[PDB]
Design a protein around this motif. Structure first.
Motif, PDB file in Angstrom:
ATOM      1  N   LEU A 183      49.149  36.609  45.970  1.00  0.00           N
ATOM      2  CA  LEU A 183      48.095  37.331  44.869  1.00  0.00           C
ATOM      3  C   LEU A 183      49.411  38.652  44.987  1.00  0.00           C
ATOM      4  CD1 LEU A 183      46.491  38.343  43.274  1.00  0.00           C
ATOM      5  CD2 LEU A 183      44.857  39.320  45.141  1.00  0.00           C
ATOM      6  N   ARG A 184      50.254  39.376  44.535  1.00  0.00           N
ATOM      7  CA  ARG A 184      50.912  40.329  44.678  1.00  0.00           C
ATOM      8  C   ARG A 184      50.529  41.695  43.785  1.00  0.00           C
ATOM      9  NH1 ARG A 184      57.008  40.464  42.879  1.00  0.00           N
ATOM     10  NH2 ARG A 184      56.297  39.659  40.765  1.00  0.00           N
ATOM     11  N   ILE A 185      50.157  43.181  44.024  1.00  0.00           N
ATOM     12  CA  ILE A 185      50.196  44.412  43.730  1.00  0.00           C
ATOM     13  C   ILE A 185      51.351  45.109  43.331  1.00  0.00           C
ATOM     14  CG2 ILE A 185      48.675  46.074  43.378  1.00  0.00           C
ATOM     15  CD1 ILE A 185      46.810  44.840  44.925  1.00  0.00           C
ATOM     16  N   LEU A 186      51.814  45.310  42.798  1.00  0.00           N
ATOM     17  CA  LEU A 186      53.292  46.084  42.036  1.00  0.00           C
ATOM     18  C   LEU A 186      53.465  47.431  42.116  1.00  0.00           C
ATOM     19  CD1 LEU A 186      54.845  43.894  39.880  1.00  0.00           C
ATOM     20  CD2 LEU A 186      55.729  44.064  42.211  1.00  0.00           C
ATOM     21  N   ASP A 245      49.867  40.734  39.847  1.00  0.00           N
ATOM     22  CA  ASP A 245      50.681  38.772  39.264  1.00  0.00           C
ATOM     23  C   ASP A 245      51.054  38.107  41.042  1.00  0.00           C
ATOM     24  OD1 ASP A 245      52.612  39.476  41.199  1.00  0.00           O
ATOM     25  OD2 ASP A 245      54.453  39.274  39.223  1.00  0.00           O
ATOM     26  N   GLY A 246      51.149  37.075  40.898  1.00  0.00           N
ATOM     27  CA  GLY A 246      51.630  36.362  41.889  1.00  0.00           C
ATOM     28  C   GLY A 246      53.524  36.248  42.201  1.00  0.00           C
ATOM     29  N   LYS A 269      46.607  31.694  38.471  1.00  0.00           N
ATOM     30  CA  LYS A 269      47.287  30.600  37.846  1.00  0.00           C
ATOM     31  C   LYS A 269      48.379  29.843  38.426  1.00  0.00           C
ATOM     32  CE  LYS A 269      47.239  30.786  33.312  1.00  0.00           C
ATOM     33  NZ  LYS A 269      46.435  29.878  32.973  1.00  0.00           N
ATOM     34  N   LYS A 270      48.811  28.568  37.907  1.00  0.00           N
ATOM     35  CA  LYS A 270      49.653  28.481  38.419  1.00  0.00           C
ATOM     36  C   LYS A 270      50.769  28.895  38.704  1.00  0.00           C
ATOM     37  CE  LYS A 270      49.718  23.515  38.665  1.00  0.00           C
ATOM     38  NZ  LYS A 270      49.555  21.710  38.826  1.00  0.00           N
ATOM     39  N   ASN A 271      50.776  29.102  36.877  1.00  0.00           N
ATOM     40  CA  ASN A 271      52.461  29.974  36.227  1.00  0.00           C
ATOM     41  C   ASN A 271      52.696  31.451  37.119  1.00  0.00           C
ATOM     42  OD1 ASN A 271      50.459  31.650  34.953  1.00  0.00           O
ATOM     43  ND2 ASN A 271      51.247  31.371  33.299  1.00  0.00           N
ATOM     44  N   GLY A 272      51.686  31.662  37.649  1.00  0.00           N
ATOM     45  CA  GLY A 272      51.634  32.934  38.600  1.00  0.00           C
ATOM     46  C   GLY A 272      51.097  34.428  38.243  1.00  0.00           C
ATOM     47  N   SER A 273      50.778  34.173  37.387  1.00  0.00           N
ATOM     48  CA  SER A 273      50.229  35.279  35.781  1.00  0.00           C
ATOM     49  C   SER A 273      48.140  35.610  36.331  1.00  0.00           C
ATOM     50  CB  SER A 273      50.075  35.216  34.569  1.00  0.00           C
ATOM     51  OG  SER A 273      49.414  34.073  34.229  1.00  0.00           O
ATOM     52  N   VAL A 274      47.551  36.025  36.190  1.00  0.00           N
ATOM     53  CA  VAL A 274      46.092  36.420  36.868  1.00  0.00           C
ATOM     54  C   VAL A 274      45.404  36.204  35.644  1.00  0.00           C
ATOM     55  CG1 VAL A 274      46.705  37.362  38.957  1.00  0.00           C
ATOM     56  CG2 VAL A 274      46.479  38.904  37.121  1.00  0.00           C
ATOM     57  N   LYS A 275      44.360  35.714  36.295  1.00  0.00           N
ATOM     58  CA  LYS A 275      42.627  35.476  35.158  1.00  0.00           C
ATOM     59  C   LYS A 275      42.916  36.373  34.722  1.00  0.00           C
ATOM     60  CE  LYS A 275      41.824  31.457  33.831  1.00  0.00           C
ATOM     61  NZ  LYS A 275      42.261  30.404  33.478  1.00  0.00           N
ATOM     62  N   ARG A 276      42.094  36.638  32.882  1.00  0.00           N
ATOM     63  CA  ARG A 276      41.491  37.759  32.483  1.00  0.00           C
ATOM     64  C   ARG A 276      40.180  37.659  33.498  1.00  0.00           C
ATOM     65  NH1 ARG A 276      39.011  39.819  28.413  1.00  0.00           N
ATOM     66  NH2 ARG A 276      39.188  38.125  27.300  1.00  0.00           N
TER      67      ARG A 276
END
Length: 142
Positions: free
Chosen positions: A27-30, A36-37, A116-123
């Motif tokens: 988990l990443r906070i830009l 995102d991830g 998510k597996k594709n490295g985006s976060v869920k709403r």
């Protein structure tokens, strides 16, 4: 009152990574506040520090930028400069092993932190009990 109270063990002393097993992302906070991830273990923005408010309630904070993980009114994760009600998460054990993080503000809606597996976060509204994306392992940083 809307959720169980099985708590994970461990503690909040040192910085950690929130690891998503399905796609292997952290988990990443830009710096611009987006969330995102990434699979890049050397990324400076995946190092997080958790702290307790009440028992089972946590803040999730970027050690690099000081941003707090938060979920807004439409269920989107973002990085907040200051702690507010959108920044508190119910941290729970799940499937006897993982950690989940439920938006305290939206706890009655069962809105989770999900990567998510594709490295985006869920709403928020797209998450629910029983999913894979909501399952994290909290890893110590090397």
């Amino acid at each position: 009152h809307h959720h169980h109270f099985n708590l994970p063990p461990g503690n909040y002393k040192k910085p950690v990574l929130l690891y998503s097993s399905s796609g292997g992302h952290f988990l990443r906070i830009l710096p611009d506040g987006t969330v995102d991830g990434t699979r890049d273990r050397s990324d400076q923005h995946i190092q997080l520090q958790l702290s307790a408010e009440s028992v089972g309630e946590v803040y999730i904070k970027s050690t690099e930028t000081g941003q707090y993980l938060a979920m807004d009114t439409d269920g989107l994760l973002y990085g907040s400069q200051t702690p507010n009600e959108e920044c508190l998460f119910l941290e729970r054990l799940e499937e006897n092993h993982y950690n989940t993080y439920i938006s305290k503000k939206h706890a009655e809606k069962n809105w989770f932190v999900g990567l998510k597996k594709n490295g985006s976060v869920k709403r928020g509204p797209r998450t629910h009990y029983g999913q894979k994306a909501i399952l994290f392992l909290v890893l110590p940083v090397s």
